Write a protein that binds this ligand. Structure first.
Ligand SMILES: CCOc1cc(C2CCN(C)CC2)ccc1Nc1ncc2c(n1)N(Cc1ccccc1)[C@H](CC)C(=O)N2C
Length: 124
């Protein structure tokens, strides 16, 4: 079975607007979402649909950009680092489940490089 998706909304968590969190949604998530390599990463891995019975045996910390978009837009994150960590988890999950030089790995690497170019310009 798939697990439930990660938590994305908690009314009890405190909420703040920051330049960094706005940039992570309006620039970083927007840019990666619209990339031609984004489609595998726009939603949780559906291991039932894809017939990957080992995916959630290997990947115990699932993450994806659909979840990251929800966390940003629901003010789930207090620290920009929480969001950056989730992007890193998503890329590393792909590197863990797959093998060096696989097509999906190259796609994740290209998205990670663009992520890093955008995080480079994270405002003060
Ligand atoms: C066979 C159909 O595959 C997909 C279709 C859609 C569509 C994309 C367009 N949207 C509008 C609707 C969902 C989204 C995602 C997938 N596939 C998919 N998602 C995530 C990953 C992924 N594949 N693969 C590639 C793979 C698939 C099958 C067997 C071996 C490796 C790997 C393993 C799950 C991966 O790491 N990711 C994140």
């Amino acid at each position: 079975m798939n697990p439930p998706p990660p938590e994305t909304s908690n009314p009890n968590k405190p909420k703040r607007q920051t330049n960094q969190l706005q940039y992570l949604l309006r620039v970083v998530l927007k840019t990666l979402w619209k990339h031609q390599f984004a489609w595998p990463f726009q939603q949780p891995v559906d291991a039932v649909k894809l017939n990957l019975p080992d995916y959630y045996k290997i990947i115990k910390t699932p993450m994806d950009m659909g979840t990251i978009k929800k966390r940003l837009e629901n003010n789930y994150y207090w620290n920009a680092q929480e969001c950056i960590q989730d992007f890193n988890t998503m890329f590393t999950n792909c590197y863990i489940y797959n093998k060096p030089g696989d097509d999906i790995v190259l796609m994740a690497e290209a998205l990670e490089k663009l992520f890093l170019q955008k995080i480079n310009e994270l405002p003060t």
